[PDB]
Amino acid sequence: TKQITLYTATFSPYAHRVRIALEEAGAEYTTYDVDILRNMPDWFPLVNPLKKIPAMTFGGPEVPPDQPSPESAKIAESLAMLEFIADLFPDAKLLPTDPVLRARARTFMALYENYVNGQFRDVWFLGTPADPLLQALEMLQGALPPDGGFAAGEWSIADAAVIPFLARMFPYLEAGLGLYSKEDGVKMRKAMASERFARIRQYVRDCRARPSFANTWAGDAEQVEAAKTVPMLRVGEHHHH
Amino acid sequence: TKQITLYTATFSPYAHRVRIALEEAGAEYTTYDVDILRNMPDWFPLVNPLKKIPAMTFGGPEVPPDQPSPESAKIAESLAMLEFIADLFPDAKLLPTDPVLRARARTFMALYENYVNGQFRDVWFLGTPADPLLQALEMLQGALPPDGGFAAGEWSIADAAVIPFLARMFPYLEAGLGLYSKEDGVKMRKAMASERFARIRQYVRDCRARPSFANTWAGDAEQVEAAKTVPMLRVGEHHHH
Ligand SMILES: O=C(c1ccccc1)c1ccc(O)c(O)c1O
Ligand SMILES: O=C(c1ccccc1)c1ccc(O)c(O)c1O
Ligand SMILES: [Ca+2]
Numbered sequence: 144t145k146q147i148t149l150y151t152a153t154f155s156p157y158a159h160r161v162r163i164a165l166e167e168a169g170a171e172y173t174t175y176d177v178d179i180l181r182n183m184p185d186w187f188p189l190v191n192p193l194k195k196i197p198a199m200t201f202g203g204p205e206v207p208p209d210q211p212s213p214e215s216a217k218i219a220e221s222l223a224m225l226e227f228i229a230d231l232f233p234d235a236k237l238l239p240t241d242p243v244l245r246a247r248a249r250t251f252m253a254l255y256e257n258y259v260n261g262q263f264r265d266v267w268f269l270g271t272p273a274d275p276l277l278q279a280l281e282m283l284q285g286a287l288p289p290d291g292g293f294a295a296g297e298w299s300i301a302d303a304a305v306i307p308f309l310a311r312m313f314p315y316l317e318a319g320l321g322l323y324s325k326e327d328g329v330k331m332r333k334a335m336a337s338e339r340f341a342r343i344r345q346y347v348r349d350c351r352a353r354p355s356f357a358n359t360w361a362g363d364a365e366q367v368e369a370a371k372t373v374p375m376l377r378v379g380e381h382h383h384h
Numbered sequence: 385t386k387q388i389t390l391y392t393a394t395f396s397p398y399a400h401r402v403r404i405a406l407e408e409a410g411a412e413y414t415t416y417d418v419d420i421l422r423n424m425p426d427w428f429p430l431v432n433p434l435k436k437i438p439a440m441t442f443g444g445p446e447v448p449p450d451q452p453s454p455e456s457a458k459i460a461e462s463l464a465m466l467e468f469i470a471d472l473f474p475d476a477k478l479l480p481t482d483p484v485l486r487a488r489a490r491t492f493m494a495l496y497e498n499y500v501n502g503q504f505r506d507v508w509f510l511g512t513p514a515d516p517l518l519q520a521l522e523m524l525q526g527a528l529p530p531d532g533g534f535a536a537g538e539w540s541i542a543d544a545a546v547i548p549f550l551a552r553m554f555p556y557l558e559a560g561l562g563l564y565s566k567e568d569g570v571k572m573r574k575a576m577a578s579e580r581f582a583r584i585r586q587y588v589r590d591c592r593a594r595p596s597f598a599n600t601w602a603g604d605a606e607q608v609e610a611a612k613t614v615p616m617l618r619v620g621e622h623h624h625h
Contacts (some may be wrong), residue, residue, distance in 0.1 A: 167426075192526075201484065218484075218487050220491045220494035220495065221497075222490065222494050223487050223498070224487070226486065227483055227484075227486065229485040230486055231483050242468055242471040242472050243459075246459045246464050246465070246468040249463065250459060250461045251458055253463055254460075
């Protein structure tokens with residue numbers, strides 16, 4: 144029953160992870176937007192000393208979000224939050240019960256975090272070459288069950304971990320968002336439409352189809368607009384190699 | 385009844401993380417060293433096609449390590465492995481039971497993976513400036529309970545995640561091992577001996593005192609020797625500004 148507050152921002156795929164898990168848990172919770180990149184509020188370091196989004200407070204007295212309680216637990220780091228939601232809500236089966244299937248879920252999150260997320264970040268925010276990101280996405284795709292399903296078979300927090308970023312990639316490419324070259328945008332677009340990535344396309348579609356996504360997504364159009372506010376997304380700038 | 389094989393390498397802190405958890409778990413297991421950085425066996429991509437240490441097999445018929453079975457579960461990524469071992473040995477209490485303390489464990493691992501490991505890498509492999517690593521260590525020291533204890537109070541896999549790296553840092557610094565200058569090496573040794581870092585020195589002592597560390601650590605001088613065999617550590621080489 145203890146309260147849950149998630150501090151969030153529409154553009155943020157990390158915050159999006161946790162909204163999805165909270166929907167899949169059926170949790171009662173409060174979200175509060177934080178302009179973390181343009182105008183961080185002065186109280187925000189009390190909920191997260193690291194000054195990143197998402198931030199979560201857990202239990203303590205019901206306060207307004209801009210009036211955080213010292214008595215609430217402050218949880219940082221979106222993957223830690225997903226595991227926490229799974230622990231709080233075992234009835235929701237947000238992880239398998241079998242230890243091998245659970246390791247499948249954990250390995251998928253690790254593969255994404257360690258080899259994929261850094262490429263999305265560099266390609267989009269630094270304009271680094273696209274080929275290593277497509278390699279890493281082919282690798283991640285190879286970890287999926289071949290005949291359909293989610294990362295560990297049944298949906299789990301592994302899929303909440305990963306869909307926010309894969310679901311952003313297609314519309315951002317179509318909107319031309321990112322500091323990569325024209326040449327790599329075409330390459331990525333043709334690639335993500337090619338037979339080689341059909342499996343990851345089916346996985347995006349399957350995850351997007353769940354209420355947890357539809358209820359945490361502003362719409363492709365609106366998410367593009369939100370991304371367009373990110374300072375690092377310096378419009379009119381591209382890098383070439 | 386299910387067999388565990390860990391493919392290992394003495395120099396590897398990621399392999400070392402999983403050895404420590406297995407010792408804490410009371411597990412029955414086999415380790416098999418792989419010269420991954422210099423002469424990888426060709427069967428190796430059969431247990432981990434990412435070609436990385438550690439690798440793990442679980443179950444299947446008991447075969448010699450160098451003849452893996454296509455029937456064993458192949459588990460990759462050391463943090464996935466730590467969670468797997470905690471799932472396999474719940475009577476060993478490798479994580480807390482309380483959800484908030486579990487979240488402490490998960491957050492500390494994410495902080496190290498997300499903000500510290502990349503800095504060690506930068507400083508030791510590219511000899512970049514030492515100061516952002518010291519800040520990130522102070523951040524991580526800040527997450528520990530100030531008056532004593534491990535990351536989550538009781539010992540947990542979060543400690544297995546982190547001590548392989550911290551425990552290596554001190555002897556490598558004594559050895560000049562790494563691409564950083566003498567000057568940054570001095571600054572780092574002085575810093576890690578100053579009162580600023582008393583708490584993280586305590587944590588390393590407390591982790592190193594447990595048998596799980598003793599039984600998985602070849603000795604300070606031996607671990608240094610193994611580290612010299614790592615090409616990217618480029619022994620006798622140093623960068624200056
Ligand atoms: O928004 C994105 C993003 C998401 C999908 C594709 C490209 C970029 C993003 C990706 C990594 C990050 O580390 C990060 O902070 C970010 O905002
Ligand atoms: O071995 C080390 C290392 C250990 C202690 C201090 C400095 C570096 C290490 C650190 C990051 C890595 O990504 C990695 O592969 C590594 O081997
Ligand atoms: Ca496969």
